[PDB]
């Protein structure tokens, strides 16, 4: 069980690192993808909707 505890913590350390990287990627992708187009494709087309 103690060896199993070390293995699970090793998975738990790996799981923690993977979840931290995945959540960092999640926040970055959320911000970039969700807000860029809703602001760029909005404004760039709204600027086109303005100027053109």
């Amino acid at each position: 069980k103690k060896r199993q505890r070390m293995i699970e913590v090793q998975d738990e350390l790996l799981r923690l690192e993977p979840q931290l990287k995945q959540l960092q990627t999640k926040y970055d992708e959320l911000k970039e993808r969700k807000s860029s187009l809703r602001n760029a494709a909005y404004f760039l087309s709204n600027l086109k909707q303005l100027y053109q």
């Binding site: 069980k1 103690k2 199993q4 505890r5 699970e8 913590v9 998975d11 738990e12 799981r15």
Partner: protein, 50 residues
């Protein structure tokens, strides 16, 4: 007399203070080991629950 030939019947044919004392000590040791498994196994259940 019959107890002495009981000796001659058992010992001829065929530890204890260490048995009793060390067995009680090791029984406390197995209680401590059950506590160890309670702690380690449960904290493993919490770790792999995480």
């Amino acid at each position: 007399n019959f107890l002495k030939k009981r000796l001659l019947q058992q010992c001829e044919t065929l530890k204890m203070e260490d048995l009793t004392n060390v067995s009680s000590l090791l029984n406390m040791e197995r209680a401590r080991d059950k506590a160890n498994e309670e702690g380690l196994a449960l904290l493993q259940e919490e770790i792999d629950k995480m």
